[PDB]
From a paper:
Movie frame micrographs collected for these VLPs, at two different cryo-EM resources (West/Midwest Consortium for High-Resolution Cryo Electron Microscopy and SECM4) yielded capsid structures to 2.84, 3.79, and 3.25 Å resolution from 29,596, 7564, and 5234 particle images, respectively, for BuV1, BuV2, and BuV3. The lower sequence identity of BuV1 to the other protoparvoviruses resulted in it possessing the most divergent surface loop structures compared to the other viruses. The largest of these conformational differences was at VR-VIII, although noticeable differences also occurred at other VRs, for example, VR-I, VR-III, VR-VI, and VR-VII. The BuV1 VR-VIII loop difference to the other protoparvovirues stemmed from a deletion of ~11 residues compared to the other viruses. At the 2-fold region, the depression was conserved while VR-IX adopted a different conformation; on the 2-fold wall, VR-VI was larger in BuV1 due to an 8-residue insertion. The melting temperature (Tms) of the BuV capsids determined by DSF were 64.9 ± 0.2 °C for BuV1, 77.3 ± 0.3 °C for BuV2, and 73.4 ± 0.2 °C for BuV3. Consistent with this observation, despite the higher (~10%) BuV1 VP2 sequence identity to the protoparvoviruses, the three separated protrusion 3-fold morphology of the BuVs resembled the human infecting viruses rather than the single pinwheel of the protoparvoviruses.
The VP ORF encodes for two overlapping structural proteins, VP1 and VP2, sixty copies of which assemble their T = 1 icosahedral capsid in a predicted 1:10 ratio. However, unlike the animal protoparvoviruses, the bufavirus capsid contain three separated protrusions surrounding the 3-fold axes, as has been reported for members of the Dependoparvovirus genus, human parvovirus B19, and the HBoVs.
Residue numbers in the entry:
A (entry chain Q): 82 to 325
B (entry chain E), E (entry chain P): 33 to 569
C (entry chain F): 326 to 472
D (entry chain Q): 375 to 521
Amino acid sequence: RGPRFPTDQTLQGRDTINDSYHAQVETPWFLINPNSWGTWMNPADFQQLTTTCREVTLEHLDQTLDNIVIKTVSKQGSGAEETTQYNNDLTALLQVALDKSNQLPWVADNMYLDSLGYIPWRPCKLKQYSYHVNFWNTIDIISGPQQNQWQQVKKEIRWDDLQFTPIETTTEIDLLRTGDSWTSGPYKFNTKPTQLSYHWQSTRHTGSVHPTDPPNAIGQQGQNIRDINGWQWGDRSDPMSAAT
Amino acid sequence: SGVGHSTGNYNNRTEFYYHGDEVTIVCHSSRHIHLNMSESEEYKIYDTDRGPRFPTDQTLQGRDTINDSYHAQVETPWFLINPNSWGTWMNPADFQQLTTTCREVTLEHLDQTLDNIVIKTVSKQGSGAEETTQYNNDLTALLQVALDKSNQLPWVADNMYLDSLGYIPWRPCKLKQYSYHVNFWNTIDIISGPQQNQWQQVKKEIRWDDLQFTPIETTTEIDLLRTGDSWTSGPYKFNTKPTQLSYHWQSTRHTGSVHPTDPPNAIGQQGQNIRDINGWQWGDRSDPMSAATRVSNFHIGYSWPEWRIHYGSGGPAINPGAPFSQAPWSTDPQVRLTQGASEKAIFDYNHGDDDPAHRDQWWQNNLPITGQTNWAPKNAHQANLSSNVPSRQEFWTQDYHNTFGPFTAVDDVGIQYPWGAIWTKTPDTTHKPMMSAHAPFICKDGPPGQLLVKLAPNYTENLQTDGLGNNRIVTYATFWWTGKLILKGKLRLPRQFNLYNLPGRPRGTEAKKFLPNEIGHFELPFMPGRCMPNYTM
Amino acid sequence: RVSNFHIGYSWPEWRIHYGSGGPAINPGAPFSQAPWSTDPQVRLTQGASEKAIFDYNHGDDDPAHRDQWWQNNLPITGQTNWAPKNAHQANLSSNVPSRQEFWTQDYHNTFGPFTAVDDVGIQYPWGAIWTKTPDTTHKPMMSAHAP
Amino acid sequence: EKAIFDYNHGDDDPAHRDQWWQNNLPITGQTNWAPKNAHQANLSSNVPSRQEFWTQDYHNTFGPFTAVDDVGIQYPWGAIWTKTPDTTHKPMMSAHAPFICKDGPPGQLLVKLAPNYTENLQTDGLGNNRIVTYATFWWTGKLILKG
Amino acid sequence: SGVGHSTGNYNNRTEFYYHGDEVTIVCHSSRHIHLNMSESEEYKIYDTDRGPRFPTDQTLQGRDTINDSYHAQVETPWFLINPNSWGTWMNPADFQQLTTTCREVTLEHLDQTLDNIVIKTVSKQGSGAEETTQYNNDLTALLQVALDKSNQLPWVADNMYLDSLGYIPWRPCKLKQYSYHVNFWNTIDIISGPQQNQWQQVKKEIRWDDLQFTPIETTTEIDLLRTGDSWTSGPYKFNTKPTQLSYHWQSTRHTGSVHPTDPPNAIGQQGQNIRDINGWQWGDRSDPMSAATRVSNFHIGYSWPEWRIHYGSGGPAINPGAPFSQAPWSTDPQVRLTQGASEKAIFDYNHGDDDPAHRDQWWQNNLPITGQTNWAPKNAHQANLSSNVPSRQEFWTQDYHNTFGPFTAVDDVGIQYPWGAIWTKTPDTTHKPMMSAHAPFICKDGPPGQLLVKLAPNYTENLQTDGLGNNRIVTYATFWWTGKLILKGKLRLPRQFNLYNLPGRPRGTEAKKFLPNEIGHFELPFMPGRCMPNYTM
């Protein structure tokens, strides 16, 4: 179920918001995704972006893999000495799958922050690809007399309706020796821009301004005009006000 | 062409055309229509009794008022032919072939004809104890046909009350009389009285001073057909968006990245959720990293005050909410949970009931669709989402709020094979609706057709004599309707390794139903039309 | 009867926003109260009615006095949904539910993907012709006043 | 939203995870706290009574008249793009990722290290099937932006 | 190209192409093959023990002799790669899409390659208590590949004993050693002894004076491959006739014109056969006109001495008879009726068993195929067919005769998805066989391929030293096999009004099987391959 999920009704179902229960299929594949800001830009270059740009779009993406190095560790000795030796296997393969057709479950976003590291000179370590299969976790927090009890209605993995897609049958896989490299080819986005500025106006800041005569000196406050001719909502006459 | 030449052939079958990803479905249909002399030759405007089961007393304190049939209508002396339904066009085997091999489908265009007009006049003979009837065909009698391609008439053509051409090809079809609403005020107050336990009729009337009455004659041009004549509608081209033929099982808990888990070691063990992980959350969340509080980009499904009764002007109505299955919350079978915006189809002998003078039922509860399922009572909200768990205060279990918003993704019901309507009229308003509660296809331009036929009157020797007499000669007609609408699908290919579970008859049903009986009585099977799982995202 | 769409929507009518910058008001959909009007004496504002004060140059006859109008949108009906009048049930079945399972006065927002609604339209003497489109993600669908 | 993060993702201390919790302080005027709001039966020159005034409803007031903003881009930890769920009525805007992909999202690149088996295969018997192996390779990419 | 460049990509998937009635199935497949140093480097000719369960005594009086494994073979030091099976080529979902949308299918042509050769040599280190092993790859070592396109070698490549590439794509495949029979005489007399209750070995020997021994080296040209090298077979084009993907339910009682019947009146009644009708019959038939004795043009199915044991030269064998279902005669489930020429498939972990070190079973009994069903004991014959009924004499119940003749129509088993062989060698004889008992496709010309690979030997410093030493260096290889065979199908369209019952998992099975486990173990489902009813005529 997860960490902090209730075993008892003392907190009467409010702990059930902590629920990690899921059913998954884990492939033996590792995911490379550059989906994050800061994989792409360092702080100074995001600042230059953010000051000089009113809004921004994604144009297109391109990515490669190269300089493959595959080694095999070989233990040596009696185990008290435990000498390890690192030999590179020149004929070993690294195999690369990219689905341009999006036939696989997508599951690639930063939630749990599985992404390439932000600072350029550290090594990055991949996380294993996996995706959900259908399951029923339904939990009743209204259960019991007085409706203070929580209960598991139906918790199961649904097998009769399930869909399992391997990487091998879905897409074509490239096999790479050491001297080989891989390029994805161009990918063109189509999306709408995002505003880089924030809006401070509510509906009280937006429209025409309530008639006010100005203050006379530095101490005084503006003075709202009592009788004005504008529109209102309900029957409003005497109380003309910017709220209504 | 003449009296002794048949004007058109009978073709009822569909054939499929597969090229690449495109699949073209051309489904022909032909019907033998029985037409009776119109009941009265004049337009009538009247209102109705309240209805069956409406309360006369406050014992049930207004809850019965959900049964309200009261309306005011104008009935024209015209009969409506509409082919708006699935199963007018396709038999079960050909809808199965559609549903297995197509990922999604559109309406391409529609065409329809009328021909082989036969008009007869019944003539009584004898003293009434013998009562010999004679059927003579009047070669010069007329059948008159109105089709509005301009949609100037009130539309009122959809399967609700299931006025549509019969589903099985070899039975005769019988038309229903065209009529439409006029404005009236039905408003009912269920809050009335002290303690607000009383229901009261606020204002129930037909509004005359503002009313609009449009006859068929002044609206459109009418074709008059003798026996040797035929009629063709000409082509009608749809413009609408496709409908998905697959159902989505993913909720927002199935959709995104998966909570980090280390695998189990052997066949008995369970996966183990990692305690300390670095992901995003919503409120202040640190120690309790959990898939429930994982931030996601979208949300799937929305809550609603399920079975909302509108009580607008014109009567109590019902505001649907989103379709979903109650199967996850189903528990015991005995009780029937309707709250998933389920629909129920009554139907008759010609519409796929086996027994004459009885009406079989179905009630699709949309069992395949899950992950869109939101039962309003089950939900909750908190004041703050933090590492701490709130108190008894700050937590509210039974609100029933509408949670539809800018972040939600939902599904329409889809096509419901035997009884479901194919298309619909788009109401002309600011902000047209986003999606339809029933009919899968919205017509961006006007909907097709709305074909109307009336049997022109045959008057006796003397006219407007009245005096406990009958004005005109008893007459009826039989003619043949043929039409084809073309569909464009997109080929469905396997997206998974394991076997799909392919379309077929409903689970509880056997195959002795759906097949003709010793008398020839059989039922058509319900087909989901959204038939297979697919990844939402 | 099942229908493909629904016309009009409920709202917590005369919602006061209390956002940053002050209490404001969140309109709801325009409709007539004439079906629920009953006696004339009482004035039912709940149809998202609007009132126009105006001055001599703007079409008042008397100088140094301000005439009023208050359009209540009497012609528009069938979009009319008074929130209190509505109800919801637990189940819709051949049986009629009990005193429990039936809730009369919720005041919920029933706007959704199935609803069709109308803007007020042009209001001749005092109504504004056009408006600025606020630049935000998801521009508004329709305007509460300007046509 | 709150972002936990690790050493490679911009935490300074190894074996510990720093936190942030963006509360979106700059964005105001969109601020609506549900409890603070209210609704009245009638809006008139008169002020309603204790009845007709309801303070704590918690209703959804999203409707055809509302304009709102997405969060925007959140630099270190925020995701750039997202998959559009294929459903009737695609969502209007995203709760987190600033960019929605109208067509399919890019990529989803997967790599596996092909297995190196020892002399004998499927021997089992408390043995290991394959040779211990690891790889290091270089990923390079460029995405272009238009501002 | 070189040491550090991969020679070919991994592609395992199938894609379908629909144009008109034609559907093109291109099914790619790719495997990772583990190859061990050949056991001995020389050709060996030897015979074997009789077998497991063969009788040493006459207690069961010869009936055990049906268990006979005795044979004489020549084992080459070569390993066989054959992709002859369904399920090497297709996963369950893609065989389902084939089987639903195709009426019949042919083999178009085959192509296959080998690449990414990796050869390593294991080197022991230490005293043997530590026993440190080291795996070094020999860059100059050779892997040698023989393919006979001329079919000069004994064919011996089919799934019986299921020597074939594994069905699921991501597991490694392990080859079996190539060998073939040499002539021997196994003849066994089960009639021996007084009272003929004794079994005796007549002559059991390997015949040397007439024998033919063909090595791989002198027969065909051999390619030698280093690491950077690859190998392609070139195209191979099949010529064979199609196989039906639908099953026939009609017997000769279902086939023809129907006996005259007047209909029933109501839902309870039975049809009523007309007493006096004018049709054809067989013998003198007049008063007893009956559908049993109706003359027909053909007969469907034939009797056989079911489970005939041949006892030819070379051993007891079994002569199949025609495939059919025992379901009509099934009665109680407990007893298992094998007589329909049923087949049983044992299989292993890589071939679709879930549990390692255990072998799951299937036993297809061909339940869908009926109307071809003839159980020999049930039949009878009479002296005369007349209006009279014969006596106790003239009627013979239990003959067991072969009734195959010029008038009979029969069906082959068809394709059996997971374990069934795709094609077969045509034996070259006068009068080639008419149809095959197992493999759906007969190769009119030579069958494809029969690809053989051996790992060339790595000898130590000293050669032919013997003296309780090992001659050569321990070595093994891993390489990648890829191939595609193309199919031509014919589109399947609905021939009926009612819903078909579409392909899917077997009836008794659930869907938790056929899906990966917590460990990753799963079974592939049996698919009938003749999946749907069709009118025989």
